[PDB]
Amino acid sequence: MKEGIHPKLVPARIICGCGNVIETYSTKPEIYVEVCSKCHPFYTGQQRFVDTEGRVERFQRRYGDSYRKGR
């Protein structure tokens, strides 16, 4: 490249609950961000915290236990 207003791009580190991406090679080393996808959380791995659906289990099957009108 060329000497001037150009970042040196030093090897860095990023911390989260997901883990420490050791390499990551970016400017402003030892940065803090909220999450890291594709490690363990963030749906690619099929988490489904709430499994939101209310058309069958309380609207079609097991219906006599309570009333209706949606999910």
Partner: protein, 181 residues
């Protein structure tokens, strides 16, 4: 030169699985990416030239490379312009720099998208180049949010040496890009 895990992930897992899939005889017709490009279409920067001073370095913080501005090609009076009027700026990233930008892209930049339920998979040009654009820029970890005052996204380009998009869809899945199946 600089040891990159994404190119290590390429050369160890992604590279040999594709030879098994399509039966590439030689080591070269296998899909390979070189020269990814980022375009920031600042159409709202037609009036101001000081706002680009506060946007070129902020795109440079996530790439590690200074971007170049692009001038207006012609003139259309429905938009405020002239033959000059620096509107957008575009930077291209290559070997050892394009790899590290993608590593921060798939894992740290991409999850910040609210309600992200996969990428649009039929966004291929037909040759093998998967384009996509983003509307927010603070998704990158280099932005601390306490230095941003203007909200502006970007259009990162894409590249491959694949003749068809069917060859690139696999490499775009084995490297880790989340799609809508």
């Amino acid at each position: 030169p600089l040891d990159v895990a994404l190119k290590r992930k390429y050369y160890e897992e992604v590279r040999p699985e594709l030879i098994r899939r399509f039966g590439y005889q030689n080591v070269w017709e296998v899909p390979r990416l070189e020269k990814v490009v980022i375009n920031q279409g600042l159409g709202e920067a037609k009036e101001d030239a000081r706002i680009l001073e506060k946007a070129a370095q902020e795109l440079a913080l996530i790439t590690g490379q200074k971007p170049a501005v692009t001038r207006a090609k012609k003139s259309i009076s429905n938009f405020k312009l002239r033959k000059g009027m620096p509107i957008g700026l575009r930077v291209t990233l290559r070997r050892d720099r394009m790899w590290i930008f993608l590593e921060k892209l798939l894992n740290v930049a991409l999850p910040r998208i609210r309600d992200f339920r996969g990428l649009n998979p039929n966004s291929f040009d037909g040759r093998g180049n998967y384009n996509l654009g983003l509307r927010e820029q603070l998704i990158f970890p280099e932005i601390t949010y306490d230095m941003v005052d203007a909200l502006r996204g970007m259009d990162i380009a894409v590249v491959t040496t694949a003749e068809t998009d069917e060859e690139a869809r696999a490499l775009l899945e084995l490297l880790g890009f989340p799609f809508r199946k």
